[PDB]
Design a protein around this ligand. Sequence first.
Ligand SMILES: Cn1cc(-c2ccc3c(=O)n(C)cc(-c4cccc(NS(C)(=O)=O)c4)c3c2)cn1
Length: 125
Amino acid sequence: MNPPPPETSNPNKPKRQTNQLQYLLRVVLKTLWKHQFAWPFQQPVDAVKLNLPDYYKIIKTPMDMGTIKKRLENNYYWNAQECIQDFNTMFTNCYIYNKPGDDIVLMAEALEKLFLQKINELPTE
Ligand SMILES: Cn1cc(-c2ccc3c(=O)n(C)cc(-c4cccc(NS(C)(=O)=O)c4)c3c2)cn1
């Protein structure tokens, strides 16, 4: 079976709005969502559908943009870095599971370049 997706709401964590978290949802997630390379990253990797039975043997911290969107909308992160770390995990999962130069890896690298361009414009803490 696929594993259940990552946790996205936790009723026992404190909640806040910050400049950075707002920007992460309204600008960074939005911009990446619409990129031509985004669709394989928009929901968890469906290892059953793709016939990739080793994916969740290899990738033990799955992450995707659907889950990040949900964490942001549910105020799951207190610090912007937690969200930034989730985007990084999503990219590195793709680099760990696949091989250098793979086309799916080039698609991740392009999304990652864009993500860094938007993170450089994060508003002041
Ligand atoms: C032979 N083969 C390999 C793949 C493959 C290999 C690695 C990846 C990968 O690392 N990511 C993050 C995503 C995909 C992928 C590609 C196309 C569609 C989907 N759909 S999904 C998000 O429902 O799992 C996922 C993906 C697909 C597909 N066919």
